[PDB]
Design an enzyme around this catalytic site. Structure first.
Site, PDB file in Angstrom:
ATOM      1  CD  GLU A 136      -3.366  -0.662   0.245  1.00  0.00           C
ATOM      2  OE1 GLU A 136      -2.855   0.376  -0.470  1.00  0.00           O
ATOM      3  OE2 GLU A 136      -3.944  -1.553  -0.191  1.00  0.00           O
ATOM      4  CG  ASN A 169      -7.841   6.457  -5.426  1.00  0.00           C
ATOM      5  OD1 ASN A 169      -7.338   5.852  -5.908  1.00  0.00           O
ATOM      6  ND2 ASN A 169      -7.959   6.954  -4.210  1.00  0.00           N
ATOM      7  CG  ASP A 220     -13.258   7.518  -6.180  1.00  0.00           C
ATOM      8  OD1 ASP A 220     -12.081   8.191  -5.814  1.00  0.00           O
ATOM      9  OD2 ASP A 220     -13.919   6.737  -5.610  1.00  0.00           O
ATOM     10  CB  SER A 243     -11.936   8.801  -2.660  1.00  0.00           C
ATOM     11  OG  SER A 243     -11.277   7.840  -3.250  1.00  0.00           O
ATOM     12  CG  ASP A 282      -6.123   5.596  -1.526  1.00  0.00           C
ATOM     13  OD1 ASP A 282      -7.334   5.199  -0.962  1.00  0.00           O
ATOM     14  OD2 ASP A 282      -5.648   5.100  -2.643  1.00  0.00           O
ATOM     15  CG  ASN A 307     -10.671   5.730  -0.362  1.00  0.00           C
ATOM     16  OD1 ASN A 307     -11.950   6.118  -0.522  1.00  0.00           O
ATOM     17  ND2 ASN A 307      -9.933   5.904  -1.464  1.00  0.00           N
ATOM     18  CG  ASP A 333     -17.621  -2.768   7.263  1.00  0.00           C
ATOM     19  OD1 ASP A 333     -18.255  -1.869   7.608  1.00  0.00           O
ATOM     20  OD2 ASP A 333     -17.629  -3.012   5.840  1.00  0.00           O
TER      21      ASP A 333
END
Ligand SMILES: [Cl-]
Ligand code: NA
EC number: 3.2.1.17
Length: 127
Positions: free
Chosen positions: A35, A46, A48, A50, A52, A59, A101
């Site tokens: 990562e 990113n 979109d 967003s 990280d 994110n 989650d």
């Protein structure tokens, strides 16, 4: 900071990530390597909108608030800025929420593509 491999493994162990939700420590070390290259200040934007953040590249679409990701959520209840310190606590505590989650470590793109299904214990060999 940029951690060394075994230094990070030891820090993750001190933070209780070893075997968290059944995921052995090497999984977490492998995820951090791929990562962020073990870099607490890593950022990635990113397409979109967003971003990280931090050593586990958490994110902003779901997990932290950066004030600039439209319609997003903040399930770790932190500003994304908290993931850009040299202390991994905020990343670890949010990772514990993420991994609990419902999709385990599959939430991490680099882990699911590059770590899962390999001998991840090798990442703590020699430590
Ligand atoms: Cl190996
Ligand atoms: Na967010």
């Amino acid at each position: 900071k940029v951690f060394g491999r075994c230094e990070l493994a030891a820090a993750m162990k001190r933070h209780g990530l070893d075997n968290y939700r059944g995921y052995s420590l090497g999984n977490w070390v492998c995820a951090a390597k791929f990562e962020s290259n073990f870099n607490t200040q890593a950022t990635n934007r990113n397409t979109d909108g967003s971003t990280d953040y931090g050593i586990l590249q958490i994110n902003s679409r779901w997990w932290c608030n950066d004030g600039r990701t439209p319609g997003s959520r903040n399930l770790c209840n932190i500003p994304c800025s908290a993931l850009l310190s040299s202390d991994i606590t905020a990343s670890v505590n949010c990772a514990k929420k993420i991994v609990s989650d419902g999709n385990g470590m599959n939430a991490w793109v680099a882990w699911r593509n590059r770590c899962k299904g390999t001998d991840v214990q090798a990442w703590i060999r020699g430590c």
